[PDB]
Amino acid sequence: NKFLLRGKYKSSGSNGIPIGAFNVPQGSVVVTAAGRVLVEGIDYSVDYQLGRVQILDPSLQASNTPIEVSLENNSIFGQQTRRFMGFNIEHKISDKFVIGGTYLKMTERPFTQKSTYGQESVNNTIFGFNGNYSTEVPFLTRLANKLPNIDTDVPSNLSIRGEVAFLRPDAPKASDFQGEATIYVDDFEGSQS
Amino acid sequence: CSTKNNTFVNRNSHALSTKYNILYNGGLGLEKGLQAIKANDQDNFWKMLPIEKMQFDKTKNPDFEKAETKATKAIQKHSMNIGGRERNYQIDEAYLML
Amino acid sequence: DIERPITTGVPFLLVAADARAAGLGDQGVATSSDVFSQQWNPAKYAFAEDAQGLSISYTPYLTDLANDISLGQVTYYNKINDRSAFAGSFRYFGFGGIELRQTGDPNEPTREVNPNEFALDGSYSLKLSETFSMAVAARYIRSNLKVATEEIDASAAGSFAVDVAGFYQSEEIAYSDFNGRWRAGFNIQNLGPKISYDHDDLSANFLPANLRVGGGFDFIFDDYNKLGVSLELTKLLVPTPPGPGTPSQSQADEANYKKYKDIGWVSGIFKSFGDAPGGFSEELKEITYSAAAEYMYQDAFAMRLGYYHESPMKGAKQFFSLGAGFKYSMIKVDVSYLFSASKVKNPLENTLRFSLTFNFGDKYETY
Amino acid sequence: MDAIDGKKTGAEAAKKDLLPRYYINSSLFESIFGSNTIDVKPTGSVEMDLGVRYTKQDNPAFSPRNRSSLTFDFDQRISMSLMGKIGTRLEVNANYDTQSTFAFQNLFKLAYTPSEDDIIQKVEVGNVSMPLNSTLIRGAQSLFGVKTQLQFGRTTITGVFSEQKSQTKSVVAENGGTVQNFDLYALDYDND
Amino acid sequence: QVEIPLKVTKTGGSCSISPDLVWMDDNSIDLALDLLTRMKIKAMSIDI
Amino acid sequence: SFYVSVKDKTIKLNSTEDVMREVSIFDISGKLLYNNKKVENTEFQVSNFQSGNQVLIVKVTLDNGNIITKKIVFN
Amino acid sequence: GRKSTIGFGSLEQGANERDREDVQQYNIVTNLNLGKLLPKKWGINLPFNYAIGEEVITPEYDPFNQDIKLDQLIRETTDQAEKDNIRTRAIDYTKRKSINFIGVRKDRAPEQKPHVYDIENFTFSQSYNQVERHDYEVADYEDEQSNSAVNYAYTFQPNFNYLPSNISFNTNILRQSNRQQFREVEVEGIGLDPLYRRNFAFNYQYGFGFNLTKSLK
Amino acid sequence: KLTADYSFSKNLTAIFYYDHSFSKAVISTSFPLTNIRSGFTLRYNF
Numbered sequence A: 001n002k003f004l005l006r007g008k009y010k011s012s013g014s015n016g017i018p019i020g021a022f023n024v025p026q027g028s029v030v031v032t033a034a035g036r037v038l039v040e041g042i043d044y045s046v047d048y049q050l051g052r053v054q055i056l057d058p059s060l061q062a063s064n065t066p067i068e069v070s071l072e073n074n075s076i077f078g079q080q081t082r083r084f085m086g087f088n089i090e091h092k093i094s095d096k097f098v099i100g101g102t103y104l105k106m107t108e109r110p111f112t113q114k115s116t117y118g119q120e121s122v123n124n125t126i127f128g129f130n131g132n133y134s135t136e137v138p139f140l141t142r143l144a145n146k147l148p149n150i151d152t153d154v155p156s157n158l159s160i161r162g163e164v165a166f167l168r169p170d171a172p173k174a175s176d177f178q179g180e181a182t183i184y185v186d187d188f189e190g191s192q193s
Numbered sequence B: 001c002s003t004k005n006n007t008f009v010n011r012n013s014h015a016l017s018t019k020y021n022i023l024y025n026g027g028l029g030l031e032k033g034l035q036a037i038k039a040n041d042q043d044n045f046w047k048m049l050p051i052e053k054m055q056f057d058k059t060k061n062p063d064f065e066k067a068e069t070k071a072t073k074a075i076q077k078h079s080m081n082i083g084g085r086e087r088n089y090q091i092d093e094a095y096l097m098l
Numbered sequence C: 001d002i003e004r005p006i007t008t009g010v011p012f013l014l015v016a017a018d019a020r021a022a023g024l025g026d027q028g029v030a031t032s033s034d035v036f037s038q039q040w041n042p043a044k045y046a047f048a049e050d051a052q053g054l055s056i057s058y059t060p061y062l063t064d065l066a067n068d069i070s071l072g073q074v075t076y077y078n079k080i081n082d083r084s085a086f087a088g089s090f091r092y093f094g095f096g097g098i099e100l101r102q103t104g105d106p107n108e109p110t111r112e113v114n115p116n117e118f119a120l121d122g123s124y125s126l127k128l129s130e131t132f133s134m135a136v137a138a139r140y141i142r143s144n145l146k147v148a149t150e151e152i153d154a155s156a157a158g159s160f161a162v163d164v165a166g167f168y169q170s171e172e173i174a175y176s177d178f179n180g181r182w183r184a185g186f187n188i189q190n191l192g193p194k195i196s197y198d199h200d201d202l203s204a205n206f207l208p209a210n211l212r213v214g215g216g217f218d219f220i221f222d223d224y225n226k227l228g229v230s231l232e233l234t235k236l237l238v239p240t241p242p243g244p245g246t247p248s249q250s251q252a253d254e255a256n257y258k259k260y261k262d263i264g265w266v267s268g269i270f271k272s273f274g275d276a277p278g279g280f281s282e283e284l285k286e287i288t289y290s291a292a293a294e295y296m297y298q299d300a301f302a303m304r305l306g307y308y309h310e311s312p313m314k315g316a317k318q319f320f321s322l323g324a325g326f327k328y329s330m331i332k333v334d335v336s337y338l339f340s341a342s343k344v345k346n347p348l349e350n351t352l353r354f355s356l357t358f359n360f361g362d363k364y365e366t367y
Numbered sequence D: 001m002d003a004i005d006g007k008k009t010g011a012e013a014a015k016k017d018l019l020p021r022y023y024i025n026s027s028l029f030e031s032i033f034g035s036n037t038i039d040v041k042p043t044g045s046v047e048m049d050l051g052v053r054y055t056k057q058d059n060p061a062f063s064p065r066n067r068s069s070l071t072f073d074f075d076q077r078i079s080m081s082l083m084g085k086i087g088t089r090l091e092v093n094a095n096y097d098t099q100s101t102f103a104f105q106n107l108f109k110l111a112y113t114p115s116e117d118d119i120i121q122k123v124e125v126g127n128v129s130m131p132l133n134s135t136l137i138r139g140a141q142s143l144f145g146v147k148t149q150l151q152f153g154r155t156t157i158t159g160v161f162s163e164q165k166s167q168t169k170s171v172v173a174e175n176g177g178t179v180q181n182f183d184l185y186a187l188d189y190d191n192d
Numbered sequence E: 001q002v003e004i005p006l007k008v009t010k011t012g013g014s015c016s017i018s019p020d021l022v023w024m025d026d027n028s029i030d031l032a033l034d035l036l037t038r039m040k041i042k043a044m045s046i047d048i
Numbered sequence F: 001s002f003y004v005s006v007k008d009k010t011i012k013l014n015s016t017e018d019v020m021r022e023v024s025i026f027d028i029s030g031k032l033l034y035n036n037k038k039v040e041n042t043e044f045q046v047s048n049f050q051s052g053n054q055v056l057i058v059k060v061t062l063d064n065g066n067i068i069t070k071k072i073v074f075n
Numbered sequence G: 001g002r003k004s005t006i007g008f009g010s011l012e013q014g015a016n017e018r019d020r021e022d023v024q025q026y027n028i029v030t031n032l033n034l035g036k037l038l039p040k041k042w043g044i045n046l047p048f049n050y051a052i053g054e055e056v057i058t059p060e061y062d063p064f065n066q067d068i069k070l071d072q073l074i075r076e077t078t079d080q081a082e083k084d085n086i087r088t089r090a091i092d093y094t095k096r097k098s099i100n101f102i103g104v105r106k107d108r109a110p111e112q113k114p115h116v117y118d119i120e121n122f123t124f125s126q127s128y129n130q131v132e133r134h135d136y137e138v139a140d141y142e143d144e145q146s147n148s149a150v151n152y153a154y155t156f157q158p159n160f161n162y163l164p165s166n167i168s169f170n171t172n173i174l175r176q177s178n179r180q181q182f183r184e185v186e187v188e189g190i191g192l193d194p195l196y197r198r199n200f201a202f203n204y205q206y207g208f209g210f211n212l213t214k215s216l217k
Numbered sequence H: 001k002l003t004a005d006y007s008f009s010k011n012l013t014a015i016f017y018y019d020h021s022f023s024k025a026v027i028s029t030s031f032p033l034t035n036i037r038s039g040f041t042l043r044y045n046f
């Protein structure tokens, strides 16, 4: 049994991307085209109650580029308690320069002390730094006004956003057997129905 | 937090509270008013320009009133004059802003 | 983890059934008198400020999994004089309606069952002194959680219990920085004959007889700001079952269980105390405690923090509790939430408890 | 000295040109909440069902002790919401529905927003969010807990401690419709 | 393939045997998967 | 339009013109008793011994993320 | 520009869900309003889109044997050709290019009388997409798509009447090219024979409405 | 199904309800069934 039929199929039905969840929280939808994050007002729109995402960029629609949609889904049941804590720093260096120092931690509380394979709890931590520098460049507008038939006056802008993040994952101490993070391939409690 | 007991925690908390963010907001108002004066179009250029541009070389720029209000709010409710000497070390900055 | 928990009948009687007490770490024996003061301390119904009060409380169970599985409470109190009060409360745990269906022409008539568990109690409280009050309550408990099938009898199991409560509330006392108030309370709960779920005297379960002792203090500043700090201790008055062995391997355990189950509830109340070769420290592992802080603004906004700690040897119920309360004109709304701190999954996790009370009638001054 | 005293019908105008050392004005003093007014009000309905349920199914195989079932029926149908303010600084927005869906529709938000000059700029209790302007470190929108915002001049520190009520879910779409991947083995044919 | 010779729990007397004798630590498999990787790399050079 | 029937310790789901994707059966304690990601409108045989437990919760995930909840008595 | 190492991931990802690979990606998108390079009197909407990008993925584990780390396997090889094969076959490389001229049209004057033969009734769309890939399964993968569309529409403004009320027409040239050369994972000597899929299409539809009589249509 | 309303005030309403259903067996694979719900419901509007 080594021959594998592997494939995919696309389900559209109606206009808009069905994200598989209903009543998605506002601000939890992230759309990535080819490694770049799209803008919620220009490149796409979200109808939250029906869980529909409509791509608005004309070039992305006729592209065949795979589009990744991430979201938060509240339609979950039987899941472990998730504790989310952390802090964020937002120092303002100047009128056009901001630096941040986010730190976050998620801990899952397992139902029992035995974590079976697939139903695993995490104790992950992520910390990072970010920098945002948004300036106005009148030189670009001056260069644009040197073009054949352009006599514009709208400002030209530049924005540089850098970020670094570090993930330190772990497992909660509750699902530890004799001091080690343990995942049970088979504790044999689920056989013999 | 009382202004009449010269405790370390009380004095430090009052200094922190007058610096953050009463005096910060007052300084923001002061700088906004200064930029409004700088970006004015009241320059004559038909006579000698004043060396220091002012509001009237009336309109009553409200940013300076905001700065004055913040300085006043910092001076009272955060001044610690317990034994004839000011314990809050940020009050002179508030008077300078005023 | 949990080594040798105390086995009692109808454990639903031990669940907090109002959002106000739930937000204060499941304690009410020494908190301020309110409409919910029947599960915790009926003796403070004589200290009520309103003449009559009604209250509805909702505690959902398994909110993510299903609806209609909840513990509801309806309380009514009426203080007739300035010294005495009557109260009546009804707690009801239910799974909601469940339809029993075989395929069998799915338009066929179906039988709906509602497995449930309720307690109905009535209490009388009387003020002895101006600062002390006592109360006696009588409770009827019924359990109908079984569904009738073949070779399964779903007859309800019933029992009766009595409650003896005492509540002390001092007058306002001025101090250097605030004029606080003192409160104390005790409550002996669920004193009654064993409940037989199978209607056989040989197979009977102890009622969850309980002892609550608590004390609290009110920091009153500015006449508009209050901070009530309360501490409660709880001990089950049911004998602990035998454990690994208390000197033929299973014969010893069988004999120990035989001698444990053949203990009267009256004698079991006293057998709960002591029964250990050690001193007070060894018995302290059977004492649960709770500490609560309630900030009150203008007697109209309430913000409650609580911590409840059981010994992890028994039960393993350790949590923090958040609570909020609002009073519009005569309608008070309480909400409570629980953050578990135990290894065992708390059934009330990720659950918002709701409470709603109406106050009407005359108003009484507080001594 | 007339401005210092204040009770001279005109000293209020002159108090502006005074050294703030000589007077205290209450217009820039505020209590723990901005006022003493209470405005949190309820809207909706509450229902009690109290009665008896009686059932009798004539199944002869059942025990005579299961002849009929008489139970007490109690039901609650809370459809409440709370909206208002405490002292123009505390904002309360809550909604409780027993008939609602599983776990997140019952909302409760307490928002304490002090003056702009306070170190503590925002406290939130209940349904909170932690939005982050970051691509590598994603925030969370469906949280229940405590969120606090502190400001020191130009340094802003936002702390959160909560329980997350949602799960992150990702989909891949090409030319509109969502893509579903499948993996079968030869032994996994459609049998019978 | 992970093989371990088994020590036998001694019977004959009482039915109740302590867990340390029922589940001997000498009979417990505790395998580092890096050993499996090392064996796989070594067997890459072993002809079938 | 959705029905769950139990005849002899066997659970039988019936949906009119709706096709299910996943089924989960939980106890009153909240413990997951059974889970199948390959629902075919068929029957289900959960382990018959449940230590005095009769009430079960059946959660059905359909084609879309719609979830149908049914409380049943295991007989 | 993004650079991620082995072991990174989201807060919610489990032990087997975190990134078991090094990722180095970049993507540049340019949007030009070329119609602004022409005088505004005769307004041309000529938007130009140019997207380029590529990503390189180095797995933590060798795709062959699936459970030995790539660095460890490369260290314990002692054969330069085998080492080079192991290093090169593991890389998952994708490159994307997109050139778009969608929505090319001429707008009407503020007060202009529509005509059936006007160029303002036409719209033009051009799309070119190219994907170049090579990974453990395919040694060379090339996907080309070209889409040329010309749309026409005109609604006439006011035996039986024979003047159409509206006329529609749109043409489409759709060309899809796929070249798939599966790799020999053992030796980088020859590889498999390339496979070609081509979907060259020419589509056109037209339509017109008639109101011959006040009742007829 | 019998119902009876009474508005105790503008916000308070009390309804008495009584549902009585009897299904008689026509074929032996069905059992006769009697369901009687009765009681009161109190509605308070805000």
Ligand SMILES: CCCCCCCCCCC(CCCCCCCCCC)(CO[C@H]1O[C@@H](CO)[C@H](O[C@@H]2O[C@@H](CO)[C@H](O)[C@@H](O)[C@@H]2O)[C@@H](O)[C@@H]1O)CO[C@H]1O[C@@H](CO)[C@H](O[C@@H]2O[C@@H](CO)[C@H](O)[C@@H](O)[C@@H]2O)[C@@H](O)[C@H]1O
Residues within 6 Å of the ligand: C054, C056, C358, C360, C361, C362, D046, D047, D048, H008, H009, H010, H012, H014, H042, H043, H044
């Ligand atoms: C059978 C079962 C129970 C049904 C009994 C209904 C009685 C309703 C009582 C309403 C209540 C609590 C309501 C909240 C609790 C609801 C919680 C429900 C939750 C469901 C999940 C306040 O409600 C007040 O709301 C006011 C509106 O602002 C109204 O004021 C009215 O406006 C004008 C009229 O238009 C009038 O001129 C004006 O004088 C009113 O002031 C009144 O409606 C009422 O006073 C009780 O408070 C007060 O109501 C009065 C009677 O009014 C009661 O007096 C007694 O009532 C009967 C004693 O039994 C006796 O017959 C009667 O002789 C006796 O005088 C007292 O009790 C009293 O304390």
